[PDB]
């Protein structure tokens, strides 16, 4: 299994994989209980009021002022039972993802995607960037810095606004310069979204109630794909967008969708990113990887006692799949770069995960949400690692009956309708 231990929220802290921690938000915060579910990956069963000091208010703004697609509940994830369920739900989703070859590939890339040690000012020393770590309270009450790649945390005020958040650098664009940074995914396994089986209905803002429910494993995978891009520092600047011209409703409102989202969804959506721009990005990131190979060649000393310069240089040789010549000078090979870049951007896509999970899902990112549902995937009678909602040898096994909220109505509680609100 991907997660070797079946953590219970109430398990006593041990200062190793169950501990109270603090994140480098450059601000003050009370320690929160976190769980390390796998090498380099932690889960914090708390609403995210930490990554963004200006978003520490879970209370919903005035009713006369709410986003069409948004859902607020200041009480969600405030009790121990909820946190226990959140932990188990997230764990089950990691297992479901890991149970597929594609998921195993993605998770392996994520674990290997350690944020680059580019925090030194002297180009002859290799040093870690402190915001790619968390402070763990040890048994003796002291804090110890631990590097990590991924953190799954509860959503902020808007419960359905799942997203990858990471701490920036004063000068470096860590998610776009090949370096990478620790990713915090705001996510919840306790809610899901309804979509429509007919493409003409799903892509229309005035039709459909949300008959089918999105499998939360796909939703998490989507965020993990973004995380993969960001950990390898090849995320596409959100300023680069597609001026949607394939949907009259998006058009009549001048709605634009970032290339990063189209890339992440994959399938036909990825084709809206023309060849010219696609090559521009590839070249840009290729040069960034070159800079990394160069910085490593200059490094003649390592900072800290955690690991040896030899170890870290190898850690990044493997992450970026660099080449090494007679002298030991690293360089980026075009073939290996294209292969890794392609893996992270074309193999790991939402559309491909749908194929592996064999579930019904939105056919394009360019659609309109219909509703948000409350769910409980923890009980095996409701959802499993192997079949999601479509339980084998039951009436829910075929035709995605498990995702059909009308047939499998006991597993879904519609909290809000979005159709017509756009």
């Amino acid at each position: 299994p991907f997660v070797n231990k079946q953590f219970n929220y109430k398990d006593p802290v041990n200062g190793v994989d169950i501990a109270y921690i603090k994140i480098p938000n450059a601000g003050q915060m009370q320690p929160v209980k976190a769980f390390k579910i796998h090498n380099k990956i932690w889960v914090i069963p708390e609403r995210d009021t930490f990554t963004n000091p200006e978003e520490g208010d879970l209370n919903p703004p005035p009713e006369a002022k709410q986003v069409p697609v948004s859902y607020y509940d200041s009480t969600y994830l405030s009790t121990d039972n909820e946190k226990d369920n959140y932990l188990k739900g997230v764990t089950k989703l990691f297992e479901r993802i890991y149970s597929t070859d594609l998921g195993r590939m993605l998770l392996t890339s994520i674990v290997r995607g350690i944020p680059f040690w580019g925090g030194s000012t002297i180009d002859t020393e290799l040093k870690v960037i402190d915001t790619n770590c968390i402070n763990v309270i040890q048994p003796d009450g002291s804090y110890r810095s631990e590097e990590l790649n991924l953190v799954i945390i509860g959503p902020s005020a808007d419960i359905i606004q799942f997203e990858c958040k990471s701490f920036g650098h004063e000068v470096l664009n860590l998610t776009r310069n090949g370096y990478g940074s620790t990713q915090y995914i705001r996510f919840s396994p306790d809610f899901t979204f309804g979509f429509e089986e007919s493409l003409e209905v799903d892509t229309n803002p005035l039709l459909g109630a949300g008959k089918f429910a999105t499998d939360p494993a796909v939703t998490l995978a989507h965020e993990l794909i973004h995380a993969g891009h960001r950990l390898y520092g090849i995320a596409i600047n959100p300023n680069r967008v597609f001026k949607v011209n394939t949907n009259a409703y998006y058009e009549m409102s001048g709605l634009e969708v970032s290339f990063e989202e189209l890339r992440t969804f994959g399938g036909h959506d990825a084709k809206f990113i023309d060849s010219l721009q696609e090559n521009e990005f590839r070249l840009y990131y290729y040069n960034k990887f070159k800079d990394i190979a160069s910085t490593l060649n200059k490094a003649k000393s390592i900072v800290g006692t955690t690991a040896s310069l030899q170890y870290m240089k190898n850690v990044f040789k493997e992450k970026y799949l660099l080449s090494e010549d007679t002298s030991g000078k690293f360089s980026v090979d075009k073939l290996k770069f294209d292969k890794l870049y392609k893996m992270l951007t074309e193999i790991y896509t939402e559309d491909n995960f749908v194929k592996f999970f064999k579930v019904l899902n939105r056919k394009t990112y360019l659609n309109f949400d219909k509703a948000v549902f409350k769910i409980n995937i923890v009980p095996k009678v409701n959802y499993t690692i192997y079949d999601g909602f479509n339980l084998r040898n039951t009436n829910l096994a075929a035709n995605f009956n498990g995702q059909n909220t009308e047939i499998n109505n006991m597993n879904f509680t519609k909290l809000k309708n979005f159709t017509g609100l756009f």
Binding site: I160, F162, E261, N367
Partner: peptide, 4 residues
């Protein structure tokens, strides 16, 4: 991000 989920999007619209």
């Amino acid at each position: 991000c989920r999007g619209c």
